[model samples]
Target: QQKLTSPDNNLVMTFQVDSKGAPTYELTYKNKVVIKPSTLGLELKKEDNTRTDFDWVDRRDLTKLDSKTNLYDGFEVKDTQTATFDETWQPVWGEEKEIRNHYNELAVTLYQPMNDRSIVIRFRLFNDGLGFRYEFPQQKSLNYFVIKEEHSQFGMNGDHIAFWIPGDYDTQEYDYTISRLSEIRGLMKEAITPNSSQTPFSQTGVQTALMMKTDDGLYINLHEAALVDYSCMHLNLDDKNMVFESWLTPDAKGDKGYMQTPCNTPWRTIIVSDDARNILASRITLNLNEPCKIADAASWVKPVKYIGVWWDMITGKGSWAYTDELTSVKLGETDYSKTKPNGKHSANTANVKRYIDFAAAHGFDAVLVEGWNEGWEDWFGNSKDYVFDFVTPYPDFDVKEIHRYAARKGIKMMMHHETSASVRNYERHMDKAYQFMADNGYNSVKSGYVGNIIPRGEHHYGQWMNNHYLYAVKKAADYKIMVNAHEATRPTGICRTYPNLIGNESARGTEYESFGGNKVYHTTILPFTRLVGGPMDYTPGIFETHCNKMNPANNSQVRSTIARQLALYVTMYSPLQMAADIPENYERFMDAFQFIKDVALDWDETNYLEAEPGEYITIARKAKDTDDWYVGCTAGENGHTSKLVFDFLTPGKQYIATVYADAKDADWKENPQAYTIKKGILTNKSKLNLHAANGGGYAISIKEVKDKSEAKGLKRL
Candidate 1:
């Protein structure tokens, strides 16, 4: 048996090899069992595909056990070594600027004496949890290998309460389900809103960054970091053993992985904490990833506020296709001039100019206009190669004129490239497409892959598409363009390295509010789960809650009060924020809009004042370059009232607080639009009784009181 402990000695991991040389490991936190003894090994595909029965090799048998199998018959373990790493590094942008990358490491070098072959298993232990990976050194005989499967097991002590989404190889856009480990089943049969082919379900598998809470009050999160040239990892539940085994998404030919010598797999991570708030503040994921590769590249990517013509499509107010109806026709072959126009096409020159005018007036950096390009008429479900002409625009939209108009208004026109899941076509035209954006004075783009991925039989989570997503980011970086991808895999702290990859809507976002909408506790739970990897372009700040006016049959609403959307600006952290609603919607409530416009996108410090997974969260943040601070608080469908002590405020500093909160009658199901704005003079020791309605929240902005006269007209709440 071997043992390893964290630097603080709070987490301890034990490894043991049985009489049969089968390797197993377990974890404990502060003397409490976290993970029981679990098996560890890998499976590989032979060069020839002619095995009568499935042929495999076990890591233990290869290391020290004599086995009947010829795969690793006489292998033996020689020696092992352990080390420690403790350091602090600063990120381009994150919850906090400075992050502590501290961990104790264990490296076990296992060798096969008979064949002179070896593999290294490295483990890093941090106070929060652990990270482990397998490294294969360049071998004398083995130059290349294909991985059939990996068997890294996460064996839990019990059937804990888990917050998870269906493990779909194609999508991560499903609404999260809260259940016990034992109750988690494949969501394929669940009667959910039939959107598109996004969440094609599976009988078994749970997506990673899996979060759960034990009955004994322990928080455990499982995920991976630094994924490069590899398939993403999902966990298949072994109910009988209470174990979660790694399941890699396979390629078209049934190969799980492809690799070369002297390579290492991405780190498998487990984060454990007693307090939920600590999990939100944890930077273990970022620390596990490599440092910025595009460090000196002069892109100057920064946090921005944008408005776009996206809501119309989600709300059924407008259509992406220029013509409402179309006969089957190839993309470029269609003479768009001869096609009839659809009155609902919202990306026209006159309409986008309104969004552009609004963005420039409100201190925004860009305006995103989707559906402006040609070929959208036959974009989805066509399975054709020639889909979008990235450089050409629809008859109603003028690319050159709009670009020039936006520049004159002091804002850049953000580009929109909706590939409709045609990965091959998009890749073929990607370089020139990005070059077009750069030439047109566009600095950022929102890339969308909204249907079944095209490279036929390839999945969004598999190695091919994983590499495709990475390709898009690196290519965008080449042009110094920022990318906010929709329908991609969830981030694994990759933003710390590639800041240009600003955000993603890989999960259910505000758009869902128009169609069946999100569950009441949805936003309340996101900060702990999705946001852990990185920020999300949630597209918050929707003043209009009810979609009944749009004529969608369900009468689905936004599921929160007006003020809750205001609070989301601060609660839902994103580098590229959108005033998601149209200008007219926000104009109806300028008092509430003040918070959305005033809140800062970048932060210097983050204090999770209060947090409970799937229940409520209160957070306070110091704006990046100013003395201003913002506090956002949210609750589930069941409303909450908590005392706010302004202790995080700078000592000996006086400030003016403007609070935008739900009105007394503001229930999400009743008076969702009702809200009140109040202001007062406050200090570090000042306290206020904060109240949020059912399915509601509150946002407060504080700025140092330089002039005493400014606080006079402000009334107390």
Candidate 2:
């Protein structure tokens, strides 16, 4: 038996071998059970005799071979080691300037006499959570093996309330469903929504970063960290026992993982705290990853607050296709000049320049123009291998002129590369694509894999695809280009090691507001679930809520008020943010739009003032390298009231705060556009009572009064 205690001595974990010679573990926090006794081991794939020998083996011989391959049982502890570690590190860009990593570790080496092999199970106990992974040491008998399935278990002590999305191998774009542990099976059907590419494995399975609340007020989150060269892990519920088991994504041949000696799996994590705010503040995921691999990352990778020529096409106000004439597009041979122009293409030179002009005038970092490249006419669902050459632009887009134009205006151009799920093609052109961006003065690329993966039977979360995603990130670093990937695997804090990976849109984002609408509580729950591992490019700040205003045929309405949209800028933590509305919409409500313009993308410190999964979230962030602070709140269908205090501010300093809040008559569905602005002078002792309407919230920007004249007209609140 082995025991490990956290640095604070509030959490304890015990590891032991059962009577059956199987490894098991249990965890407790503050004398209450967090994880019940859970078994741990892995099953390996049976070796095929056809490849090695022509003669068939006898039944008795096959049985003997199977028993030898069983690494789960017939094990004895060979050695055990314990240690403690403490360190403080800095990230290139993050929610805080510095993060402290402190943990107590226990490593158990188990020897299997029958197989003549050994493996290690290493655990790290943090003050707020626990992380463990399987490590395979170099050995002759177990040099190379294929995993059938992993058997790591998370046995819950009670039927906790859970917020989860349906487990899928291809996409993480489903809206979350909140329910009790036993209710998941009944609600699974409704929770599995439609997407371009998705494959749900089981009815009772849920994606990681799963959030749960115990009746005793403990908040628990299950996820993985530092995922590299391994398959993504999902949780399949044994609802009768209230237990979750690791379920790995499979490859083309239904194999879980292909591994060699001296490799370790990603860290399976469980974060628990009595306060919900602690779950949002925990950095276990980032701490588990290796340190930064890219030197001088700060010089090249930067936080981006940009506008795009995307919302118009997403809302059906314009089209991405340049010509309506081509039903099928061939990349090199298609003659776009011979076909009649669609006239609605929004990525033309004039339209892109308009967005660039707006970005420069509003202090945005860059302008994103999709559909400026060819192959958009038949880009999706075609499974065409040569769908797009990232370098070639449509006839209407003048790349060189725009490059010079943006350079002259001191603005950058953001590139878009829609792979159409052709993994092989994208990799073939990746080096050239990155170089093209560098030549054209583009520093960041938003690459997308928007359909079924083109490698044919491979899954998105499989080990093969996971390797490809990391390869792309590392390759992008060679050119000092940042990447914001859409329709990719959910982040597992790999950004700590590769800061150039600025953003990801793995979960359902603002684009869904155009398809139909996301739930009223969507943004409120994301910080606890999706943002637990890394930031998301949620594309927040939409001043216009009604989609019909953009297009007459589309009746979809964004299920949030204008103030809530502003609030998302602060609540949703991301290095890459976007004002995802057309310039004309911002022109009409320029006062509210100022909040989006002024909100910072990178932070020096963050405070979770209040949080309740699927209900509301309030957060305050100090801007990087400045004394400015921004606070935001988002609510659900039921409104929330907050007795807010300004104690986080400097004690002796006075600041002027500009507040944008929902109007008295505000309601998301009825009066989403109604909002009011106020200004006041505030100190650390100030307090206020505020209310957020249904599907609404508020934002406040506080700037230190550097000059006395700047605070002359502001009233004390």
Candidate 3:
């Protein structure tokens, strides 16, 4: 069945066909497109001005999207074809920027053009000002459609829109990749996620300009997403608010399990805007995918690999260790040992040194340090006198000596910065921060933003345009500094556009591990939403369950099962991955630390194994440097039972498998495991039966073992 209609202007036409249809929007202009109908997915047009403006439905206003309102009629399809209408809807208040102030309200009239079929979708930015002046532009949502929150979609915060489309394009093809490319220009390449990007024109790269002249003789390009629009989002700019936008209609085709649309290079007409002039604050979600095993060759380029042990966050030593003369506050209290007769005792405890020594001994790389800087203002501030200088040795600890010793023993130091992710405030002291690390021989910094830096008035999430965050980071990289940020900005594939940007702390992390690993599983749920934007520096692999003894805890933060912990290393992709669990646990299970150490950050490729809304999910990453593959899996609140089959291996490649699974009888309600490993071949289909025990998870690493049984033989070393 096919439906047909031309664009409001005679310059374009559209048709709707089931799976095997194409709606051509061709024009005599520069570089036109032809998307195979078999690849086309979804399309949208609306009459409701506010439709695109609201992404999430506010629990408050549920009336707008109801079918009875008839605010506008929109259309969507599966594959190729055209849907046309004999009537056209006229705008009530569409105009250029300048004419808006005087009188720019669109009219309510449906005109019969006698030969056209187009659906009308609305996108309005209904802002509610400080005083009780205008209608509160509350958040509203519809069951199906492409939408985004105001914080992320708009440049800094509020202001968002929505549109319609058929189905998601097949990612294996080039057309889907160019959807984003066919759009705007002057976009930053550092802002694209390789696997998560798409173009409006079905091109095979991040968003790049595709030129097309409008009927009035003006040119413009468009951009879309790579695989899923739900995962790919951006802001569009136009001179007016309620402008009329027209493009080439596409054709579609359907197969056993999928559908596609043939590309349509469009003939432009008019993009009537509510405002006369506008500049869109665009954004894209991407990942720092290289730091995984999937990206083996690009190791140095992708630095956020999972590692072990830390002084404060990892070893449970060093905090409140120093006593300020004026305050006499004891930070050394967090350390394992007691004070000396006069003052001073064992700085390195058995538990703390165990992981440090293990990391150096194993193939693992580095550890991060938090609560070590002058900001511990309460305990360590005045202790510049009692405690030893990190550069120079002291009576209790030798930080510089530790750095030298770790190097001699084979370990790098990752410094921590709790800048709270404020672009402005952090940049204010970025110089001192950079020099501090440089003087300490530190090349990496893992910063965080837990709280909002704004005033009490507005909400804290989805903020953009705090110039300082990206600026200070770029400057640090200029000084050869690598970054792994926590509780901060997202990865919109911008890391590729800017390689220096590594992992993000957008995960629900270990701080909540005491909550029965509830947050842990939820963290995995992010790949469906957050991860689509970029890599997560959600530091997992905790050693101790009692992370904060003083804080008591909800689920008894004792050690997690070995498998659950290992899964984090593989699941949470961090170039500068952290081992936040205390040091003693590592010493006890130097065994478990091995997996955390071996998990690679840079990857050659990534496979999104499976995903569901807020439930369970899994992913596989292949290191670009080694023949090893790591798999991370997680289950949400309700938990699930799964048996994933791995058949993506070589014909008969022998594999050394490290299995990190929950023990059949472990209780996450109180205990978490430290994993154990083994070896085998994946040539045969193998099923990993998984149990979503409350907050459940699994991590598996596969290394190619020479299959002597097959024709392949290893080179004798």
lDDT, each prediction? 0.81, 0.92, 0.40
Model 1: colliding residue pairs:
none
Candidate 1 per-residue lDDT over residues 1-717, each given as its tens digit: 779999999999987655554556789998999888886667666554232334563322233222211222233345678888878877666667678888888877666454457777788899998888888789874457778888898999999998887776777767777888777764435623355654443444678888899999999999888777788888888876789998888878878778888888888888998988888888888888878878654347877788899888888778887886677656567777887888889999999888889988888888988888888777777666778869888899998889888989998888998888889989999999998988889888899887877887877778888888989999898888889999887888888778888999888899888877888888888887888778899998889888866546547898899988888887888878998888988898988998988988888888998887777888888888778899998889787797999988889988999999998888988899999888887888888997889999899999988887887877543
Candidate 2, superposed: residue stretches over 4 Å from native? 53-64
Candidate 3 segments whose C-alpha is farther than 4 A from its true place = 1-284, 287-300, 306-321, 324-355, 378-399, 420-428, 450-465, 514-520, 546-561, 674-678, 687-692, 707-717
| TM-score for candidate 1, residues paired by index | 0.94
Error of 1 at 691 (Å): 2.2
| Ranking according to lDDT, highest score first | 2, 1, 3
lDDT of 3 by residue, 225-305 (tens): 122112222223331221112122122211111111211111111122121111010111111111122122234443644
Q: Please list the residue runs of candidate 1 whose C-alpha ends up more than 4 Å from where it truly belongs after superposition.
A: 49-77, 112-116, 186-188, 191-195, 198-204, 297-299, 551-554, 715-717
Q: Which prediction has the highest TM-score against the true structure?
A: 2
lDDT of 2: 0.92
TM-scores for all candidates: the values are: 0.94, 0.98, 0.53
Question: Least lDDT summed over 10 consecutive residues: which range in candidate 2?
Answer: 51-60
Best by lDDT: 2
